């Protein structure tokens, strides 16, 4: 697959550096690279496609090389250059789509899409140009495995899950206690609540805790922590734990006093931030532990005093929230982002040609259950298709 990436890169550089009027000095090395690609692909008959609606296409290469003695390129030259470059761009496009659609459970890293295997043969190692891109460099450093890392802006590491736990409850749901939460994308939003406003808690303080287990540990994550989670700070009617009935939630928000967040890697406390909002940093972690508290305000102006009674009704319910957003992070294993269209590209090529459901990926490349169950086979096959998509996006975009 290094051969595939180098093919895409040398076609990109051919489309860019080989332009009218440029000095031959500017492109001599790329000219020799292009000639090497031509001569080492000549006479090789490739076949691509044949899964789903993806058509079966045959590629036969017999192209002329590019002159050398010139001092400045001109239009008579770039015309031949484009006549070859268009065909090659088509070839790598089809190969990338083929490898993206293909898939396997056993030995996922190895290349499917027999065109790509033929490229992985020994005849084609003379094409290897330079493995500069982030994804290809990570691929090599993983292949001869050293520690590596992908950097993500706003990584959708959490699976979309909105839910709640009710520590206190009764079949009329008039006096509840518990924790609502929504983990979606790179947002955590957790809101604890007491319908009695911590009337009978010890020292009028109620503890809320929420543990979030990342499927993959993140590294050097820049995080923004704010109070007053906003999605759980307006009236709602919420289906019960099992859908029997629906209970009313009427929040009135206080600040979360003595909030703390602990970032944990295999149990131990890697980081702990107490009552510190704004931007924080987690050097390395696999679990987040948000622990906040709802304290009954000791002094009550008459309005809030009317709000929180000693009696039973509880027409309003005290809430304390937290928002935690992973602005950027570094991860061992590939994930989707808001900054890179790798998942979008692979899913688009699969949906376009209606590929039947394979053994390992979920149907439709649903990211939620592709990150909920993220076994090593899923992980490394996902990395393969993602890096092929990275190769493709260099040209077809």
């Amino acid at each position: 697959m290094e051969v595939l990436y180098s093919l895409s890169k040398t076609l990109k550089d051919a489309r860019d550096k080989i332009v009218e009027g440029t000095l031959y000095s500017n492109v001599s090395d790329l000219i020799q690279q292009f000639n090497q690609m031509i001569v080492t692909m000549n006479g090789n008959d490739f076949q691509t496609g044949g899964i789903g609606n993806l058509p079966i296409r045959n590629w036969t290469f017999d192209f002329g090389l590019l002159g050398t003695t010139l001092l400045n390129l001109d239009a008579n030259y770039v015309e031949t250059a484009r006549t070859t470059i268009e065909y090659f761009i088509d070839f790598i496009d089809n190969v990338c789509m083929d490898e993206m659609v293909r898939e396997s459970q056993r030995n996922g890293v190895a290349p499917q899409s027999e065109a790509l295997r033929k490229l992985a043969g020994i005849k084609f190692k003379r094409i290897n140009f330079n493995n500069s891109s982030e994804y290809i460099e990570n691929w090599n450093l993983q292949n001869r495995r050293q520690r590596t890392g992908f950097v993500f802006h706003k990584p959708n590491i959490f699976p979309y899950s909105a839910s709640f736990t009710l520590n206190r409850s009764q079949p009329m749901h008039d006096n509840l206690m518990g924790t609502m939460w929504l983990n979606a994308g790179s947002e955590i939003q957790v809101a604890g609540f007491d319908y009695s406003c911590a009337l009978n808690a010890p020292a009028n303080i109620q503890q809320f805790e929420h543990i979030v287990q990342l499927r993959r540990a993140l590294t050097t994550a820049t995080i923004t922590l704010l109070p007053d989670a906003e999605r759980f700070s307006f009236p709602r009617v919420i289906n019960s734990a099992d859908g029997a009935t629906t209970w009313f939630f009427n929040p009135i928000i206080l600040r979360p006093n003595n909030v703390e967040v602990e970032f944990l890697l295999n149990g131990q406390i890697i980081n702990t931030y107490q009552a510190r909002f704004g931007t924080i940093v987690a050097r390395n972690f696999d679990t987040i532990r948000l622990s906040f508290q709802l304290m009954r305000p000791p002094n009550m102006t008459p309005a809030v005093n009317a709000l929180f009674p000693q009696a039973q009704p509880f027409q309003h319910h005290a809430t304390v929230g937290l928002t935690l957003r992973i602005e950027s992070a570094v991860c061992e294993s590939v994930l989707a982002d808001a900054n890179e269209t790798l998942l979008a590209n692979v899913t688009a090529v699969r949906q376009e040609y209606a590929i039947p459901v394979g053994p390992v990926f979920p149907p439709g490349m649903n990211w939620t259950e592709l990150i909920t169950n993220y076994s090593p086979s899923r992980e490394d096959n996902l990395q393969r298709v993602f890096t092929v998509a990275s190769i493709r996006s260099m040209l077809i975009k």
Binding site: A162, S163, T165, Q170, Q310
Partner: protein, 275 residues
């Protein structure tokens, strides 16, 4: 041991569904509590049969509807037994019965836990705002005498009952509150009236108090500041008891939709007597 310590994790997107079943009775039972004025004004006696026949079309099978007939509000206040599942209590408002109706409402609408009080032997206190003393009987005259820390009556001599202070005289039911944390010597006619030290648990929601007459006067919460309007503290407007019963029958689906069959007890008493 219903495992009432572990949290239950729900979901906020799935789904609106049906409640499966419950097999302890074939179906719930509705249960009217009306005063004898209703029967006397109706001047009938197949009317319970007719009301049952009319509930049947509303969708209550025959055996489910029961009727109970108390003499009047004060005579029902003494040991109000709710032998039943969905209790409605039609309380005809009358002037000067405001506090007694409030007493009965605060009694039945809430879940009380009562201990005995041996008045002859010991003094007593009130642990917190939720602790009342509830006295019932044919006639209660609760005379209290608060004592200082030194067991000396303040404003009263413990040896002279005439100096004691009457918080409630000649009541069939008295939910008496006294200042919390001060010992009291009690005196009431132990032959006729009994008294209990009752703490208030959460609310009881089998019972719907339908005030049939005047304005919103029920104040269940002994706190002067709060005066909540519970959903089960109903108030209907009346000229004729036939109209009242017809409205109840017609709208009974909402009456039970605002209640819950769950908060029911084995014994029919209005409190849990914990000795």
């Amino acid at each position: 041991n219903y495992g009432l310590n572990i949290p239950i994790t729900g979901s906020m997107d799935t789904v609106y569904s049906n409640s499966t079943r419950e097999e302890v009775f074939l179906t719930s039972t509705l249960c009217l509590y009306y005063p004898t004025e209703a029967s006397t004004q109706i001047s009938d006696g197949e009317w319970k049969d007719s009301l049952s026949q009319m509930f049947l079309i509303k969708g209550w099978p025959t055996g489910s509807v029961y009727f109970k007939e108390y003499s009047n509000i004060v005579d029902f206040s003494v040991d109000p037994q709710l032998y039943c599942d969905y209790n409605l209590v039609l309380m005809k408002y009358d002037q000067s019965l405001e506090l007694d109706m409030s007493e009965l409402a605060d009694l039945i609408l809430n879940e009380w836990l009562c201990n005995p009080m041996d008045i002859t032997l010991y003094y007593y206190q009130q642990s917190g705002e939720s602790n009342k003393w509830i006295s019932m009987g044919s006639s209660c005259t609760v005379k209290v005498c608060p004592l200082n820390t030194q067991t000396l009556g303040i404003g009263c001599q413990t040896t002279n009952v005439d100096s004691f202070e009457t918080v409630a005289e000649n009541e069939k039911l008295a939910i008496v509150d006294v200042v919390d944390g001060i010992n009291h010597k009690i005196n009431l006619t132990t032959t006729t009236c009994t008294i209990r030290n009752c703490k208030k648990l959460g609310p009881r929601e089998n019972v719907a108090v339908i005030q049939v007459g005047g304005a919103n006067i029920l104040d269940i919460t002994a706190d002067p500041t709060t005066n909540p309007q519970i959903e089960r503290m109903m108030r209907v407007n009346w000229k004729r008891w036939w109209q009242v019963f017809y409205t109840i029958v017609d709208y009974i689906n909402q009456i039970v939709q605002v209640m819950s069959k769950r908060s029911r007890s084995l014994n029919s008493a209005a409190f849990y007597y914990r000795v």
